[PDB]
Amino acid sequence: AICSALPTIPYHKLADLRYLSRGTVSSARHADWRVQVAVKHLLDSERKDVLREAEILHKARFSYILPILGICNEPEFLGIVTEYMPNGSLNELLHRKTEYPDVAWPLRFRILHEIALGVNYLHNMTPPLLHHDLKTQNILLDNEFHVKIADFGLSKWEGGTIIYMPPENYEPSIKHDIYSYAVITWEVLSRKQPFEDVTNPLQIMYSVSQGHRPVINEESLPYDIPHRARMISLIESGWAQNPDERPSFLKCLIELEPVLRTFEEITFLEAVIQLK
Template sequence: METSDSPPGSMGLLKTFDSSEFGSWEKIGSGGFGQVYKVRHVQWKTCLAIKCPPSLHVDEKERAELLEEAKKMEAAKFRYILPVYGICSDPQGLVMEYMETGSLETLLASETLPWELRFRIVHETAVGMNFLHCMNPPLLHLDLKPANILLDAHYHVKISDFGLARWNGFSRADDVSRDGFCGTIAYLPPERIIAKDRVSDTKHDVYSFSIVIWGILTQKKPYQGKKKKRGKTQN
């Protein structure tokens, strides 16, 4: 199995795509991670998703990070992990399976889900995360949240966004994000917030998953009321 110290130029089974291979570029998401486009592969006659970094001009460091994310997703190939096919060369981006229903975050906010579906989403996410943690070495996701749990046309789970993921036991100098945290603060274990330089393990993902479960069962965002209360106090 390839880890973060595998040969930097190695693509494994991943393919390099040219933007000319795709048509009908449609932006379907954006944020701090960059932009996500729905595209149609001209020869394959199928829709795919391309996640591009925030910067239009990707340097070597950013390209290496993109490749590392793709290699982690390729190594973690499983029915509940979002499939990755390769990297688009210009613009730079990850070429992945297109998920028709979109993110769990959007779904939870848009309609009341039947309990059977909520339980199935919890179960499939648990099986996907268990697969990651049973790898050798375990692959830590470190940013599990509803926005990174995607659903296909039949509402089956695919865990996505491995930009912060790392192999357990392999630390990185840039393991902490720009705001001082690795991951999204509402889903971070308290000990990770208190000690920002703490080395994460599988317990990090377990805590994040517990918050995800709460959000699925209640169809609310964590600490939503607390944020509103703070805002009123400041005013």
């Protein structure tokens, strides 16, 4: 096999450094490469955390995995330099309903297809690489609303949200990811926050362990949803209470492939224009 090194970017090379999202993510431009970049940064000497993610991104290079451009490793500042995703996260697409009144079905299905393509690829690495922290927050969208999977901090070969975590991992597995995906799939097709009613996050955890899942009915998932039955089948088998009843991503892709072929090329382009 052949080897490739991740470039070292001097901090001084990053211009127009502005805050983007809370480590912390900042937008910037590289003074020589003349492109916009995003920089994730903190500072402790237990900073192998930053170097580990960088190494993962660098080795997990693929079409649907956030491309890393370089490491910014200095005594003064430590950061990960990646491509800038101008359309943020899938979370913001699904839930900023004023800004995005419509998110057309072909786009929703392409996003789902692409999330699955990235994760599958990770799972097919040698040895398999598991995400373990899939959430709408980490599904980044480029200029044409194509998927780039990010956040490999909790990924292996204090925190936040719990709704995408399988019940078996509550007291800490190649089947964690699919559960997360299933919840994402549900959230994507509904534009509903999972366990919307339940305000107490610990209460959610109780319910989930008692077999409960987000509500699958006419109200959340309408009848007009393309391939509703085949999708609901996928969502349910994905978020199974039993880990062994959950499908691989390869299996899901095979299921999704003809579903994606039912949408004409132009509808993706139409969906993106509607959002801009």
